[PDB]
Amino acid sequence: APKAVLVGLPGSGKSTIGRRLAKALGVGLLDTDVAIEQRTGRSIADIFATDGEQEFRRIEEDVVRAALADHDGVLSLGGGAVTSPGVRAALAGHTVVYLEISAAEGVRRTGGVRPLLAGPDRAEKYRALMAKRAPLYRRVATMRVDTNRRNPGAVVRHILSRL
Numbered sequence: 001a002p003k004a005v006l007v008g009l010p011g012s013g014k015s016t017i018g019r020r021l022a023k024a025l026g027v028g029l030l031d032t033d034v035a036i037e038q039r040t041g042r043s044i045a046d047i048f049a050t051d052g053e054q055e056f057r058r059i060e061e062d063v064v065r066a067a068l069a070d071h072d073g074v075l076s077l078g079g080g081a082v083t084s085p086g087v088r089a090a091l092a093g094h095t096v097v098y099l100e101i102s103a104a105e106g107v108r109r110t111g112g113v114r115p116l117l118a119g120p121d122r123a124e125k126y127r128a129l130m131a132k133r134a135p136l137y138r139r140v141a142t143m144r145v146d147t148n149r150r151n152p153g154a155v156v157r158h159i160l161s162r163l
Ligand SMILES: Nc1ncnc2c1ncn2[C@@H]1O[C@H](COP(=O)(O)OP(=O)(O)O)[C@@H](O)[C@H]1O
Pocket: 008, 009, 010, 011, 012, 013, 014, 015, 016, 017, 079, 109, 110, 147, 150, 151, 152, 155
């Protein structure tokens, strides 16, 4: 089982903190998004525009379950994995770190790709994403970490200390 599973909105820091957390613990980082693009050979943005969410979610879910079982390092899920009921059930019992972030900072971090965030009105879309998913992240989380006024190193240490 992963030493920690990272969840949160896009831009909350799953990929960044996961890497640094991994390097700290001395284990590998498995980023479900990355893993996906491999089992598919295609990019996530292309799977979205070619198969849609329901399909990306089933793939994601299959990767997540596998990772939860075979990966002992740090696991970082895709921003919306928690929307799949199967992913939420598979997480039960695991160490799940919920990286919290405000909508203002979150949107500014994701400035620069995300199929669900992209295009105009990212502030509105980001906020909608938060309203929808906030409840889900909180349900699966065993550890909530506020990343608003904490630089990466501080978030990593805050987590390391509570593991
Ligand atoms: N604690 C933090 N404070 C400052 N910037 C951060 C923090 N965590 C993440 N970032 C930055 O925010 C951007 C998105 O982080 P990323 O790990 O890609 O998010 P996610 O994997 O959740 O989409 C990156 O450029 C990263 O350097």
